């Protein structure tokens, strides 16, 4: 820096703000010629580029000046009207709920963040959790419980547990923080009796709950799960969609769904952080979901990524050595790998760079850092051929570190 | 709400945020059939829409995964370059300093609260100052100081007056937040020896300097100044740039240039916030610089908002009564009236809607709201026959007020 010990202008939360080495390590590897299952991306490949060309043309003809002028904080009308008709047809989400444009769920979340949380406010998270998140719910200060999934998502007897025990020491839950469906990373999906039951302990223990959705049209086997917000009879849940994995994430675009009183809030607070959501964006967005391309698009998709998901599960039950154990997800872009333990796969992923294959250590999935055997691994942006050779490498990798 | 006390679950900073009553009904003034100078958006006329679809054909031709693709949260590179080029070239702003791609100034504005401000930290602004910054800035609890302007900006002999008894108090600023030239809302334009004076006094008494530029290139008359940054031998000063008024707003693409240290402080506070600025937005406008079209734009952007400035100001000249005052910008989009005084024009609002005419109230743009006679108008989007006419409305307005 210019101007020497620049941290004496930095506030309190600045001076935490940090790097991740991890993180900038995998920056590094994936401009490399390393295989990497590390990546967080949708491919390319799936990004409906003739419809996105003709959506522009339409709108230079026809919608130029709506969009290249300011927007509303909440939103482009439109936008926001096809969301809920295609919502409520679509998922069965109530009409009752209100509607707020997003410069992308990430800033859903920060939005969350600053309506609801005082430092020390409790959030409980997913063990994994959607590591975005607890970097956006962090500049708040929250205290977090963790509560671990299985098989069939969030344990919420787990969770049912620890509030009983958070009352007996007077203290509460303001917010439950799910991805229940592909999560990311976990790749599993919250079963019905579940979500019903988050819900009774959301009206007995007088909570708010955040369903974060980024995937559930990327369904490749299985039947459609019910929306948590579908289920929501009281107006307790906050849902959010974004564009970002269904049309392309370089539109910035996602919404909210829930109670009135929160959303006017979430518009008031959004007015400070970015004034509006990109318009020209919202109206690509809106052609594509009224133009009914959006429905004509995403079986192909499906189309896309599930023989990738297939050759990933087929390459792990092959190659891993016996005692590692991994997900088997329905949809979405991950699959999540538990190591016999107790492999330390931050330590590990030195090693399986060296043998030319990368992964996320599944580490900084979890609010408290306490699991160090996970790993997340993607399927969706590479492609089938290295998809196996780099199941192998990291295969061979967890042979040579179960060995002195 | 559906949850009742909604209010239960809101942080204490949510618990302030409140709607404007004077923004709502402003709102509801520019959808009716009253002629309204209270509008701050550029006139979609001066949008270069046929270069603007030029270059979304190119960009569907060459750039599209790029365009379609999350991006990196310091912004995408070719854009990053090129403007730190123009910037050079054009205003002589050294290339030591490092740059962001901000979703908006707006978003820049935040992020220096996120960044800086801790609670009671001391803010200078202007009296008058833009609006949303102090909405920006509020969020993080700041103390303002505001130095008053005159017909050639901020009153920097005020400023060192105000600095001289904070350290008498043993306090210190921490930033000048000025909008130094063509200011929203007041017109005017800091000169040039109040520039170096200013920045004299951030060596001195050790602040940062944002200086926010939206308008520098809707200049209409005069000679271009010196930016505040093109002077900053230090890297004590951030410079806010944006393409909302010189492409469209739609894209809400800005940029934010100063010190490594501090950007690379912005950039781990902005990735929690929305993870990367829209990336379609910044190849629009990495093309519409590099490509030579934001050069040849700008000079129509000037003869099309010229007249308009001029028939604002030979309107005030031939229908205001004696003891009005207002300021003479020689560029962008507003001029700033000042009522002999008793008269207030926010109790006057009602009046001029009356008469079929609105302009914004200055008081909502003190950090003290403590200023009562000022009015901002706008002559960007209005048209020149609605120009006159609604300064007619609003002279015989003000005639009628002075009548006790
Ligand atoms: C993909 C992902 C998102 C996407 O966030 P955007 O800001 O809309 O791109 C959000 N939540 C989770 C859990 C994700 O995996
Ligand atoms: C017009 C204006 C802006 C624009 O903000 P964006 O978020 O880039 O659209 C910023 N600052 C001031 C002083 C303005 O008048
Ligand atoms: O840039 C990234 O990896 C984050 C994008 C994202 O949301 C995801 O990885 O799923
Ligand atoms: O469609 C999906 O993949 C998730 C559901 C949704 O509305 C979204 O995209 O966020
Ligand atoms: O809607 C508005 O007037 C706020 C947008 C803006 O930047 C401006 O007015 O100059
Ligand atoms: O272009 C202007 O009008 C101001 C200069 C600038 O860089 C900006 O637009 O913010």
Redesign the interface.
């Known amino acids: 820096?210019?101007?020497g010990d620049?941290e004496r202008?930095?506030?309190?939360?600045?001076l935490e703000?940090?790097?991740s080495e991890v993180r900038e390590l995998l920056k590094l590897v994936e401009t490399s010629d390393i295989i990497s299952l590390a990546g967080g991306?949708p491919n390319?490949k799936t990004?409906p580029?003739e419809i996105?060309?003709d959506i522009?043309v339409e709108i230079?003809e026809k919608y130029?000046?709506k969009?290249?002028?300011?927007?509303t904080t909440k939103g482009f009308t439109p936008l926001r009207e096809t969301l809920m008709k295609w919502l409520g047809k679509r998922y069965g989400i109530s009409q009752?709920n209100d509607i707020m444009i997003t410069?992308?769920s990430?800033?859903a979340?920060?939005l969350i963040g600053?309506?609801?949380?005082?430092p020390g406010?409790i959030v409980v998270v997913e063990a994994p959790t959607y590591l975005?998140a607890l970097?956006?719910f962090?500049?708040?200060e929250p205290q977090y419980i963790q509560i671990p999934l299985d098989d069939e998502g969030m344990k919420v007897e787990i969770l049912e547990e620890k509030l009983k025990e958070l009352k007996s020491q007077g203290k509460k839950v303001?917010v439950v923080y799910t991805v229940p469906t592909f999560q990311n990373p976990a790749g599993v999906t919250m079963n019905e009796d579940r979500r019903k039951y988050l819900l009774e302990l959301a009206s007995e223990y007088d909570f708010?709950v955040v369903e974060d959705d980024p995937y559930g049209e990327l369904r490749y086997s299985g039947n459609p799960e019910k929306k948590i917000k579908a289920l929501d009879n009281?107006?307790?849940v906050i849902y959010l969609g974004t564009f970002?994995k269904i049309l392309?994430?370089?539109?910035?675009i996602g919404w909210m769904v829930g109670?009135?009183?929160?959303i006017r809030?979430m518009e008031?607070?959004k007015?400070?952080?970015?004034?509006?959501?990109?318009?020209?964006?919202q109206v690509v967005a809106w052609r594509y979901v009224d133009g009914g391309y959006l429905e004509k698009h995403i079986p192909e998709i499906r189309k896309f990524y599930k023989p990738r998901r297939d050759a990933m599960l087929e390459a792990l039950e092959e190659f891993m050595p016996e005692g590692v154990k991994w997900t088997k997800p329905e949809g979405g872009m991950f699959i999540w790998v538990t190591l016999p333990d107790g492999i330390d796969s931050k330590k590990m992923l030195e090693r399986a760079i060296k043998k030319g294959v990368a992964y996320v250590p599944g580490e900084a999935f979890y609010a408290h850092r306490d699991v160090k055997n996970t790993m997340r691994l993607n399927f969706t942006y590479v492609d089938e051929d290295k998809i196996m050779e780099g199941i192998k490498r990291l295969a061979e990798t967890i042979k040579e570190e179960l060995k002195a």
Do not use: H, W
């Not at 969009?67 to 927007?71: E, K, R, T, V």
């Not at 392309?248 to 910035?252: C, Q, V």
């Open positions: 820096s210019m101007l620049v202008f930095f506030s309190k939360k600045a703000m940090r790097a991306l390319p990004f580029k996105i060309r522009l230079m130029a000046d969009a290249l002028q300011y927007g009752d410069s992308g990430q800033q979340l920060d600053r309506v609801f949380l005082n406010d975005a970097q956006a962090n500049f708040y303001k708010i009281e107006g307790r970002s392309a994430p370089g539109f910035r109670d009135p009183g929160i809030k008031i607070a007015q400070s952080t970015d004034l509006c959501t990109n318009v020209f964006g």
